Design a protein around this ligand. Structure first.
Ligand SMILES: CCCCCCCCCCCCCCCCCC(=O)OC[C@H](COP(=O)([O-])OCC(O)COP(=O)([O-])OC[C@@H](COC(=O)CCCCCCCCCCCCCCCCC)OC(=O)CCCCCCCCCCCCCCCCC)OC(=O)CCCCCCCCCCCCCCCCC
Ligand code: BCL
Ligand code: BCL
Ligand SMILES: CC[C@H]1c2cc3[nH]c4c(c3C)C(=O)[C@H](C(=O)OC)c4c3nc(cc4[nH]c(cc(n2)[C@@H]1C)c(C(C)=O)c4C)[C@@H](C)[C@@H]3CCC(=O)OC/C=C(\C)CCC[C@@H](C)CCC[C@H](C)CCCC(C)C
Ligand SMILES: CC[C@H]1c2cc3[nH]c4c(c3C)C(=O)[C@H](C(=O)OC)c4c3nc(cc4[nH]c(cc(n2)[C@@H]1C)c(C(C)=O)c4C)[C@@H](C)[C@@H]3CCC(=O)OC/C=C(\C)CCC[C@H](C)CCC[C@H](C)CCCC(C)C
Ligand SMILES: COC1=C(OC)C(=O)C(C/C=C(\C)CC/C=C(\C)CC/C=C(\C)CC/C=C(\C)CC/C=C(\C)CC/C=C(\C)CC/C=C(\C)CC/C=C(\C)CC/C=C(\C)CCC=C(C)C)=C(C)C1=O
Ligand SMILES: COC1=C(OC)C(=O)C(C/C=C(\C)CC/C=C(\C)CC/C=C(\C)CC/C=C(\C)CC/C=C(\C)CC/C=C(\C)CC/C=C(\C)CC/C=C(\C)CC/C=C(\C)CCC=C(C)C)=C(C)C1=O
Ligand SMILES: COC(C)(C)C(=O)C/C=C(\C)CC/C=C(\C)CC/C=C(\C)CCCC/C(C)=C/CC[C@H](C)CC/C=C(\C)CCC=C(C)C
Ligand SMILES: CCCCCCCCCCCC[N+](C)(C)[O-]
Ligand SMILES: CCCCCCCCCCCC[N+](C)(C)[O-]
Ligand SMILES: CCCCCCCCCCCC[N+](C)(C)[O-]
Ligand SMILES: CCCCCCCCCCCC[N+](C)(C)[O-]
Ligand SMILES: [Fe+3]
Lengths: 302, 281, 240
């Protein structure tokens, strides 16, 4: 058989690449990391360096604080027993304050306060990391696609644990930190709103999720199919169409009747994935604020 | 009719079946023997679907629904109005799909590229076959399959799910979802990365890839790279769908109880099974 | 109600978005043509997008798309029927002529430069500090064609410096000249490198590069093109 180019058949390594410099504060970048030959079979073998900076540290510190604040709670639940801790790891749960406290920041710690702390930590963690995606791009003079794409994701998360709990009048409507518990909450959230399968945003959202898989399958297999013509070197192909780009476009034109360009295909991409949580966010936001039951809504349309 | 660079690619050959017979195009479209096959299967299937619609007495697409035979029929044939029509329609779909794949193969050859696309598609086809062929057989009636209707199919999903409790607890379902989510994440990034390089800040020069790799090491301390992210995508996708099949093929066959309950195995390991406190003690 | 508002709104958003998406992918190979090269009559509902101009690094100019399209090379094809939609048969050697699955595009005759302005791809001999870190080092292994005959020997690996990737195998033929072989079209074995697309007798036809320490976008295309085309056109020489 023919070679498929899913895995490299010869690895090649040179002096650690410290990357483009530009407006980047080189003081902040780290030191190169070890090289992983393991990873080298798939993508790049080089680890690091990474850029630290102020926002990275804040993000990274709040990030751990969040995770740990949950962790101690799990331990307190486990009776500080490492055996129970392992047995019951997916059953533990840090739940929001009771509906009694409403949008109150005065819930006792064992009764919801600890959840607020953890969330506060996550909030700062996530937003700082957002600002990080933006700045990292600015400092290289790049488009801010990544930060805007990221914002979509942030939308759904914002809505789940912040905007919806606030518009409903209580934190109790938010998602608990826990493996099995956040699954249950999800399953239950649908039951209460009259089956999310009638939420047309939910349905839209699924279409874009399914689609993301469909597309990234299409794009990936295509680029691999024409990497025998340096297909995978997309910017240069954009700047100077190679046979790669041509065979790519034509295979698709001949199959289904229309086609992308190399820059084009990546717009299809960023929008198909970004629409998942965009539509998603909206479906959930209206759920319980404007629409109490999607089946009833489904019967009338109003 | 042709893209400005299409003509030099439109040469004879690459057909799997039938030589030069169907070796030709119709507008942008490539026909090929399988071009014909899929058309025929697609024609037939849509017909039968309309025919089901008159027996049902509705032309409204939100209502139309073609159901498999009821469990009483097992894996035997059933009367048209009583499940036959779905069975043929299913045969015709399969015919369509497989044929559509083989045409992709034929186009691949004419263009001289790899077969990765036909390849990946076969995973979609295999997921569909899991739900209407492999699972029902193994379970023992066409009746376990999902019906062909816009909402009725969402209903099968919901009913089939809730049969084993909250389906969220199906462990291969957990794995399959992690890919779906991960893949979307990665499609989000890849797209965004290339665009931001090709469309930099106003008045600046097209960044380069060397920028793409840098932007990510700066961000998370590693860059899977260009060839990588495309290998990654193909994989996450194919995996999502692979585990999706798996979670269903096991459901109802080797596990028919509540999925949540299957986790009792973990919690009941003799070394901590009786230790008091926590959630389960 | 609000919900009804939102969803109706979205289906509208989505429609202009597809429209956008679609017109952006119309930046190359449009407008459409008839098999004779004259502009086709029906170009679809979508207008050509307004042109956009790319500023290429290292003072390599600009690119504006859509723009005037031209093959900028002869096409050795002849019609096989009297109506539209049928194949065009090569009038010579498709390989030698570069049509079919052997097609190449008239890319610029300059090499791809890395972020610093140095040649992206280099023979490893001239790439200070690069080495095969894993897998079988091809260098020195004979090269076998689909006809199971030896055609040459690997005498170097041309690496991609910015990604540390093996792109092509450089091969020394019986007459002492060398050719590049795309990495993606050869199987490196324990005792040989096997090339399924080309039979031993076609390796000489592989287009040559003008300078021994560089490849240009044009030469990459002519090579990849040629080797790929072997799959369909060497077919009579391939046995297994
Ligand atoms: C409620 C929801 C609120 C929830 C918040 C979540 C928001 C998440 C949005 C994420 C958007 C991802 C987009 C990716 C992208 O292109 O980013 C780069 C893009 C350019 O990045 P750059 O670095 O500035 O420029 C680099 C190059 O110069 C320029 O580079 P370039 O060429 O790549 O960029 C050009 C780009 C410019 O992209 C944009 O301008 C982005 C537009 C954002 C739209 C937001 C969607 C909102 C959804 C509404 C749904 C309605 C429900 C109610 O072109 C487009 O993509 C055009 C989009 C076409 C939209 C079609 C609209 C149709 C209107 C209806 C017409 C009638 C139809 C006929 C029937 O970023 C933006 O323009 C930023 C948008 C931020 C707005 C956020 C909303 C604030 C609240
Ligand atoms: C695989 C998982 C489950 C399942 C769970 C769900 C859930 C959950 C949802 C859907 C949704 C949809 N499902 Mg389903 N669905 C299954 C199997 C199928 C089959 C199949 C033959 O196997 C198909 C064709 C569909 C098709 C569809 C669409 C009607 C709709 C949007 C999907 C999408 O965007 O995908 C991505 C693909 C693309 C963007 C490519 C283009 C796809 C177009 C839209 C295909 C439409 C075909 C349809 C109109 C019938 C044509 C058949 C005849 C030729 C006329 N499902 C199985 C049983 N399906 C969502 C919905 O909103 O519908 C109620 C939804 O919420
Ligand atoms: C019983 C369950 C209910 C149901 C209830 C819900 C609920 C409730 C919700 C969904 C949601 C979704 N459902 Mg539903 N759903 C059902 C059945 C289905 C079926 C099916 C039957 O086949 C499918 C395919 C889906 C599919 C989907 C997705 C399309 C959608 C979420 C998209 C997403 O990627 O968010 C994943 C992405 C995120 C959550 C974004 C978060 C990003 C943040 C910033 C990440 C930060 C990381 C953190 C800080 C930790 C750092 C990481 C560590 C360092 C490692 N549902 C049934 C009807 N579904 C969501 C939705 O949008 O609905 C409209 C939602 O809220
Ligand atoms: C558009 C929709 C999709 C999307 C897009 C998206 N997400 C994004 C982005 C984009 C475009 C980014 O740019 C941003 C990113 O930087 O990615 C590289 C991000 C991102 N999406 C993430 C996760 C994520 N996205 C998700 C979803 C999605 N993201 C959507 C499907 C999901 C889910 C639930 O499906 C998750 C879990 C992060 C990887 C990253 C945002 C990172 C962040 O905000 O960090 C804040 C806080 C920290 C620094 C916390 C660190 C704490 C950890 C140390 C604790 C855990 C330790 C653990 C035991 C370690 C071991 C792991 C082992 C595997 C080795
Ligand atoms: C494996 C990963 C994902 C994937 C990949 C994938 N899909 C693919 C490909 C690939 C690589 C293609 O090459 C091929 C393609 O050409 O894309 C443009 C395809 C494709 N994936 C498609 C759809 C699709 N893929 C899906 C899923 C996925 N595809 C995965 C998530 C889904 C869903 C539900 O998630 C859908 C709806 C098509 C757009 C296209 C294949 C087109 C095709 O087969 O044409 C032949 C058939 C016809 C013209 C119609 C036949 C009519 C039937 C005879 C009767 C109708 C019966 C049907 C069962 C009724 C169902 C009714 C519903 C309401 C339930
Ligand atoms: C970098 O490179 C790449 C490209 O370009 C350079 C590409 O284009 C693409 C392809 C991707 C796109 C153009 C983006 C948009 C695509 C999607 C969102 C995927 C979803 C697709 C669809 C909804 C279209 C589905 C359409 C189909 C299957 C065909 C429609 C067909 C008909 C109406 C007729 C079907 C054919 C028949 C019956 C047989 C042939 C005809 C005869 C009469 C016989 C990719 C992936 C890519 O990676
Ligand atoms: C230029 O740089 C780069 C990019 O570009 C812009 C990128 O995009 C990215 C971004 C990409 C990523 C973060 C992706 C990383 C990927 C992952 C972490 C993997 C995703 C997948 C998972 C988390 C799922 C894990 C699942 C596993 C291991 C399951 C393995 C298999 C089994 C257990 C067997 C299954 C059998 C079962 C269950 C039997 C059941 C039996 C009975 C019921 C009985 C990066 C980093 C980058 O660097
Ligand atoms: C090994 O043991 C130690 C102790 C060392 C550990 O560290 C182990 C730690 C683990 C056991 C930790 C385990 C952690 C998990 C199981 C976490 C799981 C988390 C999820 C499943 C989360 C799902 C969903 C979360 C959502 C949607 C959160 C949303 C958050 C927000 C939008 C934030 C909103 C902000 C709030 C309410 C406060 C705002 C206040 C202001 C003043 C602005
Ligand atoms: C990126 C463009 C592709 C978008 C796919 C649009 C078709 C999805 C159809 C979903 C059917 C939905 N709904 C609203 C009735 O639930
Ligand atoms: C959703 C599928 C869309 C495919 C679009 C195909 C464009 C075809 C252009 C018209 C060609 C006409 N024909 C078949 C009559 O010759
Ligand atoms: C949900 C995905 C639907 C894809 C949108 C359909 C776009 C069709 C574009 C046809 C272009 C016609 N043309 C110019 C190629 O002849
Ligand atoms: C690709 C084949 C798909 C066929 C789907 C279901 C067809 C059922 C065939 C059973 C016909 C008769 N029987 C019971 C005597 O075998
Ligand atoms: Fe790409």
């Amino acid at each position: 058989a023919e070679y498929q180019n899913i895995f490299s058949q010869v690895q090649v390594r040179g002096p650690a690449d410290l990357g483009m410099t530009e407006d980047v504060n080189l003081a902040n970048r780290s030191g190169v990391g070890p090289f992983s030959t393991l990873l080298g079979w798939f993508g790049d073998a080089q680890l690091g360096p990474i850029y630290l900076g102020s926002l990275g540290v804040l993000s990274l510190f709040s990030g751990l604080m969040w995770f740990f604040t949950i962790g101690i709670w799990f331990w307190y639940q486990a009776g500080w027993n490492p055996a129970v801790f392992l047995r019951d790891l997916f059953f533990f749960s840090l739940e929001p304050p009771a509906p009694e406290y409403g949008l109150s920041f005065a819930a006792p710690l064992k009764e919801g306060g600890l959840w607020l702390i953890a969330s506060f930590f996550m909030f700062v963690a996530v937003w700082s990391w957002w600002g990080r995606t933006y700045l990292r791009a600015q400092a290289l003079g790049m488009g801010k696609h990544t930060a805007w794409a990221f914002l979509s994701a942030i939308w759904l998360w914002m809505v789940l644990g912040f905007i919806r709990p606030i518009l409903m009048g209580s934190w109790s409507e938010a998602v608990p930190y826990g493996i099995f518990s956040h699954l249950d909450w999800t399953n239950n959230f649908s039951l209460v709103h009259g089956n999310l399968f009638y939420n047309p945003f939910h349905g839209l959202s699924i279409a874009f999720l399914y689609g993301s898989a469909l597309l990234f399958a299409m794009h990936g297999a295509t680029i691999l199919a024409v990497s025998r013509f340096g297909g995978e070197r997309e910017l240069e192909q954009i700047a100077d169409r190679g046979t790669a780009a041509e065979r790519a476009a034509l295979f698709w034109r001949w199959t289904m009747g229309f086609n992308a360009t190399m820059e084009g295909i990546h717009r299809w991409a960023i929008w198909m994935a970004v629409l998942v949580t965009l539509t998603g966010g909206i479906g959930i936001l209206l759920s319980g604020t404007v629409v109490d039951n999607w089946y009833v809504w489904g019967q009338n349309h109003g | 009719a042709l893209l400005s660079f299409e003509r030099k690619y439109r040469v004879p050959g690459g057909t799997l079946v039938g030589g030069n017979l169907f070796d030709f195009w119709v507008g942008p479209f490539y026909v090929g023997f399988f071009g014909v096959a899929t058309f025929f299967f697609a024609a037939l299937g849509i017909i039968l679907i309309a025919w089901s619609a008159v027996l049902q007495g509705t032309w409204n697409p939100q209502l139309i629904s073609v159901y498999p035979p009821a469990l009483e029929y097992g894996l035997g044939g059933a009367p048209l109005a009583k499940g036959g029509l779905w069975q043929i329609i299913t045969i015709c779909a399969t015919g369509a799909f497989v044929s559509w794949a083989l045409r992709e193969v034929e186009i691949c050859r004419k263009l001289g590229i790899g077969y990765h696309i036909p390849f990946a598609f076969a995973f979609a086809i295999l997921a569909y076959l899991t739900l209407v062929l492999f699972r029902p057989v193994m379970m023992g009636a066409w009746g376990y399959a999902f019906p062909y209707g816009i909402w009725t199919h969402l209903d099968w999903v919901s009913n089939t799910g809730y049969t084993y409790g909250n389906f969220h607890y199906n462990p291969a379902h957990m794995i399959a979802i992690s890919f779906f989510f991960t893949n979307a994440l990665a499609l989000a990034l890849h797209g965004a990365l290339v665009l931001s390089a090709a469309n930099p800040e106003k008045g600046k020069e097209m960044r380069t890839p060397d920028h793409q790799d840098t932007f990510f090491r700066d961000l998370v301390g590693y860059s899977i790279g260009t060839l990588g992210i495309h290998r990654l995508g193909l994989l996450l996708s194919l995996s999502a769908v692979f585990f999706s099949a798996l979670c269903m093929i096991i459901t109802g066959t080797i596990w028919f109880d509540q999925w949540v309950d299957w986790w009792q195995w973990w919690v009941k390991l003799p070394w901590w099974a009786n230790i008091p406190g926590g959630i389960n003690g | 109600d609000l919900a009804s508002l939102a969803i109706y709104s979205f289906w509208i958003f989505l429609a202009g978005l597809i429209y956008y998406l679609q017109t952006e992918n119309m930046r190359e190979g449009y407008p459409l043509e008839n098999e004779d090269g004259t502009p086709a009559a029906n170009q679809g509902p979508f207008p050509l997008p307004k042109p956009k101009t790319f500023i290429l690094p290292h003072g390599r100019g600009t690119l504006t798309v859509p723009g005037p399209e031209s093959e900028d090379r002869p096409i050795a094809l002849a019609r096989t029927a009297v109506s539209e939609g049928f194949p065009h048969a090569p009038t010579g050697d498709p390989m030698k002529d570069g049509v079919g699955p052997a097609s190449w595009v008239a890319r610029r005759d300059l090499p791809e430069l890395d972020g610093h302005g140095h040649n992206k791809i280099k023979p490893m001999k001239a790439a200070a500090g690069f080495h095969v870190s894993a897998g079988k080092n091809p260098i020195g292994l004979p090269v076998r064609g689909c006809d199971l005959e030896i055609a040459g020997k690997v005498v170097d690996i041309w690496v991609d410096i910015p990604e540390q990737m093996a792109r092509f195998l450089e091969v020394e033929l019986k007459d002492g000249s060398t050719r590049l072989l795309p990495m993606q079209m050869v199987k490196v074995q324990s005792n040989r490198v096997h090339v399924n697309a080309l039979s031993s007798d076609l390796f000489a036809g592989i287009p040559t590069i003008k300078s021994p320490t560089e490849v240009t976008l044009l030469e990459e295309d002519k090579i990849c093109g040629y080797v790929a085309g072997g799959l369909m056109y060497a077919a009579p020489k391939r046995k297994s």
